Swiss-Prot record:
The PA14 dyad binds strongly to pectin as well as to polygalacturonic acid and alfalfa cell walls, but to a lesser extent. It is found in: Cell membrane. It comes from Acetivibrio thermocellus (strain ATCC 27405 / DSM 1237 / JCM 9322 / NBRC 103400 / NCIMB 10682 / NRRL B-4536 / VPI 7372). The chain holds residues 358 to 644 of 644 of the full protein. Interacts (via RsgI N-terminal anti-sigma domain) with SigI3. This is Anti-sigma-I factor RsgI3. Signal peptide: none annotated. It comes from the Bacteria. Anti-sigma factor for SigI3. Negatively regulates SigI3 activity through direct interaction. Binding of the polysaccharide substrate to the extracellular C-terminal sensing domain of RsgI3 may induce a conformational change in its N-terminal cytoplasmic region, leading to the release and activation of SigI3. Induction: Up-regulated in pretreated yellow poplar (PYP)-grown cells. Residues 5-138, 149-287 form the PA14 domain.
């Protein structure tokens, strides 16, 4: 029965971002060694969500067990039974819940790999059920809404004043790398005065202290992880440079907000990053998510 199992959502980050593919796994019995579930998933920092329904054979006290590297969360019947979302070598965790023979219960298992070894196994036991891998005959995949690939770039609001007040249009900018060079991006302005807000998500290649850099002809603010790390909103200098630092982990998304105001100069703004292993560059569209 091709259809039996749970639906597995496979992401290339460890926080259920960078969605790659869905597939129906007949059971949760994976040992990926130091590798990945599929050639389309990169080594390290990945996550999997399995959802559907489990059907016990007996009306009894079930024990659910997870053996994972790294972390896990297990819901059965909307109860969070196991909450061990952490870095761990292969480790069993378990909890009990009372179920009724032949009833179909919601099950959701969230898993992630950080580094080194990766595995995920879901088992059950009861008075009459000898401890096994939960088999495909007792598991029904969810259907309903597939996950959506998010779009690269950031959601930009363009304003017809310098104070982020009069909103003219929204689009997705591939990156924050603009030399507008007197042809303002917004029409019908007074005194060349306009402003922009980019919102979305960013992820990094490396775990370490990043430095974000703005080069700008007007005022800038930058938030990363909802921390204000650049604040030069009054600036007028041509290609004025600001920097600010934040510690980030590879393999997960962080909020990003960038605000720009032009005070009538020919407009310019670039957002760069650097770190001990990241050489200074314009932050690339492939690390920016529009959400
Ligand atoms: Ca990854
Ligand atoms: Ca691991």
């Amino acid at each position: 029965g091709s259809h039996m199992g749970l639906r597995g959502e496979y992401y290339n980050n460890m926080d259920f971002s960078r969605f790659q593919f869905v597939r129906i796994d007949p059971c949760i019995d994976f040992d990926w060694g130091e590798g990945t579930p599929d050639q389309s998933i990169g080594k390290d920092t990945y996550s999997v969500r399995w959802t559907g329904k489990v059907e016990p054979r007996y009306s009894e006290t079930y024990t659910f067990y997870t053996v994972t590297d790294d972390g896990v969360r297990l819901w059965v019947d909307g109860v969070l039974l196991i909450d061990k979302w952490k870095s761990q070598s292969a480790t069993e965790h378990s909890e009990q819940i009372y179920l009724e023979a032949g009833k179909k219960y919601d099950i959701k298992m969230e898993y992630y790999q950080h580094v080194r070894a990766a595995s995920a196994k879901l088992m059950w036991s009861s008075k009459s059920q000898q401890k096994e891998i939960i088999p495909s005959s007792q598991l029904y995949p969810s259907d309903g809404p597939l996950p959506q690939k998010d779009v690269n770039g950031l959601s930009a609001e363009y304003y017809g004043d310098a104070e982020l007040k009069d909103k003219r249009f929204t689009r997705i900018d591939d990156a924050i790398n603009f030399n507008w060079d007197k042809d303002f991006p917004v029409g019908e302005l007074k005194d060349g005065k306009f402003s922009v807000r980019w919102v979305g998500k960013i992820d990094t290649r490396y775990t370490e202290e990043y430095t974000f850099h703005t080069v700008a002809n007007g005022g800038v603010r930058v938030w990363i992880n909802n921390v204000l790390i650049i604040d030069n909103w009054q600036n007028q200098g041509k290609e004025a440079e600001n920097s600010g630092k934040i510690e980030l982990k590879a393999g997960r998304q962080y909020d990003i907000k960038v605000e720009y105001c032009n005070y009538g100069e020919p407009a310019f703004i670039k957002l760069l990053w650097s770190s001990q292993r990241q050489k200074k560059e314009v932050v690339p569209s492939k690390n920016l998510f529009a959400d």
